[PDB]
Design a protein around this ligand. Structure first.
Ligand SMILES: NCc1ccc(Cl)cc1CNC(=O)[C@@H]1CCCN1C(=O)[C@@]1(O)c2ccccc2-c2c[n+]([O-])ccc21
Lengths: 10, 276
């Protein structure tokens, strides 16, 4: 149930 | 400048419960943390599936401290590599992306204590993580201090209270924001007599006994987080322990066990200067 972080980090 | 919080000590403002700690120097059942209360709090985040892995702490602009079992624990088939995780610093909310506040860092290398004992009692439950790039400090991101021999000797006493923080389970049930709880250090004999697990000098336990009334404990998800104390001598926060293990969460007669940071300081320093 975690939002979603910017793609750069992933 | 470690252990001095931008939103509190730096502005001469006190948080709502630090007084409880000072008076003693003579997460289950906790409460929501105040903004900027634990600027050194770090969230170990798993890339896929995206989820909370453990807590951790910031000790410099490029080093993060956590519990070894958060990264390596054969019984549960846990053996993460640096590319499997991310480090989220400056957070308050557990699940939301705090744009303009938190900073997400990648891991360059993981260092587990050579003598970490995962097969028996989590002895030497400690690990270091070097970030690929230094994180910029701010009102919400700031390193905590590591204790020296004198600090440990003076504050690591039965009855003296420390503070534990984390985004772990609220009951043995996930919190919206970072949770905090102050717990008293418990004398060694009591710790030893509360479990069948062998206790070592590299760990100390904390929590209230049933006759004290008050409650509180770390729980699953809090591992790796810091157990800190505010020195009454220099008004700086020191990380005395690392959330390590416990039988259940907040059970009467049981206590939370924490990795004795000062006892493993030697290892910490060696790793630091050897690898940048
Ligand atoms: N249990 C929640 C809890 C409560 C208080 C604190 Cl301070 C920390 C924690 C979180 N830590 C854990 O759960 C850790 C993760 C590794 C095994 N842990 C234990 O604890 C645990 O009691 C446990 C629980 C379930 C299955 C096996 C074991 C186990 C095996 N050993 O050798 C020591 C301690 C434990």
């Amino acid at each position: 149930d975690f939002e979603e972080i910017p793609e750069e980090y992933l | 400048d470690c252990g001095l919080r931008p939103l509190f000590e730096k502005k001469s403002l006190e948080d709502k419960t630090e007084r409880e700690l000072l008076e003693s120097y003579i997460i289950v059942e906790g409460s929501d943390a105040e903004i900027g209360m634990s600027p050194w709090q770090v969230m170990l985040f798993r890339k896929s599936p995206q989820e909370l892995l453990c807590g951790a702490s910031l000790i410099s602009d490029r080093w993060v401290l956590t519990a070894a079992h958060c990264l390596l624990y054969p019984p549960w088939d846990k053996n993460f590599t640096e590319n499997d995780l991310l480090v989220r610093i400056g957070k308050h909310s557990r699940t939301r992306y705090e744009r303009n506040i938190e900073k997400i860092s990648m891991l360059e290398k993981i260092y587990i204590h050579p003598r970490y004992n995962w097969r028996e009692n989590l002895d030497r439950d400690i690990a270091l993580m070097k970030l690929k790039k230094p994180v910029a400090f701010s009102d919400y991101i700031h390193p905590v201090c590591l204790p020296d021999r004198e600090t440990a000797a003076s504050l690591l006493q039965a009855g003296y209270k420390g503070r534990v923080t984390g985004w772990g389970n609220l009951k043995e049930g996930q919190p919206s924001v970072l949770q905090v709880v102050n717990l008293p250090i418990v004398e060694r004999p009591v710790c030893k007599d509360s479990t069948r697990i062998r206790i070592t000098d590299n760990m100390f336990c904390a929590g209230y006994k049933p006759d004290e009334g008050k409650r509180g404990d770390a729980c699953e998800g809090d591992s790796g987080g810091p157990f800190v104390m505010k020195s009454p001598f220099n008004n700086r926060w020191y990380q005395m322990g690392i959330v390590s293990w416990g039988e259940g969460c907040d059970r009467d007669g049981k206590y939370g066990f924490y990795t004795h940071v000062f006892r493993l300081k030697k290892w910490i320093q060696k790793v630091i200067d050897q690898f940048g």
